[PDB]
Design a protein around this ligand. Sequence first.
Ligand code: HEM
Ligand code: HEM
Ligand code: HEM
Ligand code: HEM
Lengths: 139, 138, 144, 142
Amino acid sequence: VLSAADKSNVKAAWGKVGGNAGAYGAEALERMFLSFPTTKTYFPHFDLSHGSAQVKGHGEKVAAALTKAVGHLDDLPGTLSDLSDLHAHKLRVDPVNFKLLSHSLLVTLACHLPNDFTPAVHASLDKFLANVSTVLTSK
Amino acid sequence: LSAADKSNVKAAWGKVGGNAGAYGAEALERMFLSFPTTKTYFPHFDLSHGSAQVKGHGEKVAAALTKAVGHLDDLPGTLSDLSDLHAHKLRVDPVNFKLLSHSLLVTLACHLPNDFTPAVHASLDKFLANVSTVLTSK
Amino acid sequence: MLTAEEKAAVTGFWGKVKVDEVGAEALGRLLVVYPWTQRFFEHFGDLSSADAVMNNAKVKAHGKKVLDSFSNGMKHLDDLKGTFAQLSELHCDKLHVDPENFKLLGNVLVVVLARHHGSEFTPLLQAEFQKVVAGVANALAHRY
Amino acid sequence: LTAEEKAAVTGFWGKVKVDEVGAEALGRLLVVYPWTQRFFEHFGDLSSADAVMNNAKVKAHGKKVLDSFSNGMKHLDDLKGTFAQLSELHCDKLHVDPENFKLLGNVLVVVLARHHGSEFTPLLQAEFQKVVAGVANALAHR
Ligand code: HEM
Ligand code: HEM
Ligand code: HEM
Ligand code: HEM
C-alpha cells in the first residue's frame, strides 16, 4: 500500500517487460481462463480459445492499463477513474476475479523473466496488482 | 475515497461519541467470543468478561478509529505508527481485521439501530477496510 | 460444533426474529454494502441507490426465501451439508457465485440481527449464530 | 481429475527440482505475504528478503512441505487421508486459518513457472491449479 521500494520494483520489472507488454497481458488472460474458467463468464460474446484475435487485442488494453498505472503510480485513483467506473459500476467484477488475474500476471511474468522476478519484485507486484485491483472496484 | 463515504463516516462516528470506548471494548469482546482464534494474539491479556485490559484496550482501539476518522484524507499518514505495530511487530494476519471489523459493525448496529442505515453501513465497512489494509500494508 | 445447550438459545432466540423483514433487509444491505453482488441480480431492475435497492419488491421478495432457507437450515442443524446440497448446485455450477460471497451474506445477516435485537442479542448468543452462518456458508460451497 | 491428467502432472512433477523448489516457494510466501512470518518467527532471522531466502530452516521446512507435497501426488484421491495429519497441526495446534494454504499453493505455482519457463504451459498451470486447490482444501478439512 505501497513503499518507495515498491514503486521502484514495479517500474523496474515492467521496464524489462518492455515492448512485450502486449503479449504478456494476452497470456495472463489466456492463463486466467483455462486456470479459472468461472472467469470466462465476464467475456460472454468473445472468442475465448487459444491464439485468439480478441484474447490478444484485449490484452493490449489490459496491459496498456497497467503501463499507464506504473507510470502514474502516485495517484492510482485519478488514473484509473474510468476503469473502476467500468469494472465497478457498469460490469461489477467480483473482487476475487481481480486477484486471479493478478496471479496470472505474476505466473506470466515469472516464466518469461526468471532473473528479474525476485522475491522482492514478486513482493511489490502482488501489492501493485492487489492495489490496482482495489482502485478498480471503488467509489 | 468517495466523499459521501467520508461524510457518512463522520456522522457515523459523531453519534457514537464517547461511547466509542465502551463499544471498542464490546466489539473486542464480541470478536473474542465469536472468533476464539483471535485470542491467540493476546496471551498476555486476562480475557474473562469485564477484564480491565480488555476494557482498557477497547478504549485504545475506539480512540484509534476516532483518529482515523477525522484525518480521513491521509491514512498511511496518521496510522503509520500503527501499521508498524500491526504489520511489522505483531505481524497480524489480515483475516483477523475482517474479524475485528465485522464485530464493531455488529456492536454499532446493536447500540445505534436508527443511525445504522444501509448507506452509512457500507461506508463504515469500506472504511474499516482501508484502516486494515493500512495497518497491514508495509 | 453445536452442543444441545448451544442449540436452544439459537433455536429459542430464532423465533423472536422477523425472519421476513430481517431477510429483505439483509439482502438489501448485502447488495448496497457489497455492490458487485448486484450482478447476480441485474434482473431485479433498479439498484441505482441505497433506497431503491431497499424498497425494491424483489430484493424484499428474495429477502424472504433465503431467511426461509436459514429457518429450514435451522430446523435441520446437524445436516446443513445436505439440506443445502441442492443450493450448492444452483450457486456453484449455474450462477457461479464465488464462495467468499456467501460468507459476506452471513456476516451481514449477523449485523441485521444486532440492529433488530440490540442488546437482547448478546456477545455469547452472537457466537453461536456465527457457528450457524459459518456452517451454512460452509455447506453452500460444498460442491466446490 | 482423470488419469489423463494424473499422468501429465506426474510427468512434470518428476522433472521438478524438489529440494530447492520448496525452499524457494516457502521463502516467497513469507516474503510476499509478510504476515505468514509469525508462524515461523521461531525459525529465526526473517528480518528481510535475503535473510528469509537464505535462512536454513526456511530451507529445510521448504523440503519437508514440498515433500509432503509429493506424497499427495501419489494419493490424489484421498488427499483427505494424506493430509489429515497435517490439517491436524495446521488448524488445531497452529491455528493457521485456511486462506494461507491457498496462498502457498499459489506461491508454489508462481515458482514452477520460474524454474521451467515456457514448458509450464498455460494448460499445465490449470492442472496444477487444481492440485493446489485440493491440497489447499485437504489441509482445510478440520
Ligand atoms: C489489473 C487489473 C485490470 C485491468 C488493468 C483491466 C483493464 C481493462 C481495460 C483496459 C479494459 C478495456 C477498456 C477499453 O477497451 O476502453 C477492460 C475491460 C474489461 N475488463 Fe478488465 N482489467 C483488469 C481486471 C479485470 C478482471 C479480473 C476482469 C474479469 C474477470 C475484467 C473484465 C473485463 C471485461 C469483461 C471488460 C470489457 C467487456 C468486453 O470487452 O466485452 N477485468 N479492462
Ligand atoms: C481496526 C483495526 C485495528 C485497530 C485500529 C487497532 C488498534 C490497536 C491499538 C490502538 C493498539 C494499542 C497500541 C498501544 O496501546 O500503544 C493495538 C494493539 C494491539 N492490537 Fe490492534 N487494532 C486493530 C486490529 C487488530 C486485530 C484484528 C488484532 C488481532 C486480533 C489486533 C491485535 C493487537 C494486539 C495483539 C496489540 C498489542 C497490545 C499491547 O501491546 O498492549 N489489532 N491495536
Ligand atoms: C447465506 C447464503 C445464501 C443462501 C442460504 C441463499 C439461498 C437461496 C435461496 C433460498 C434462493 C431461492 C431458492 C428458490 O426459490 O428455489 C436463492 C437464489 C439465488 N441466490 Fe442465493 N443464497 C445465499 C447467498 C447468495 C449470494 C452471496 C449470492 C450472490 C453473491 C446469491 C445469489 C442468488 C441468486 C442470483 C438466486 C436466484 C434464485 C433463482 O434461481 O431464481 N445468493 N438463494
Ligand atoms: C498447504 C501447504 C502446506 C504444507 C504442504 C505443509 C506441510 C507441513 C509439514 C509436513 C510440517 C511438519 C510435520 C512434522 O514433521 O511434524 C509443517 C509444519 C508447520 N507448518 Fe506447514 N504446511 C503447509 C501450510 C502451512 C502454512 C501456509 C503455514 C503458515 C501460514 C504453515 C505453518 C507451519 C508451522 C508454524 C509448522 C510447525 C513447524 C514444525 O513442525 O516445527 N503451514 N507444515
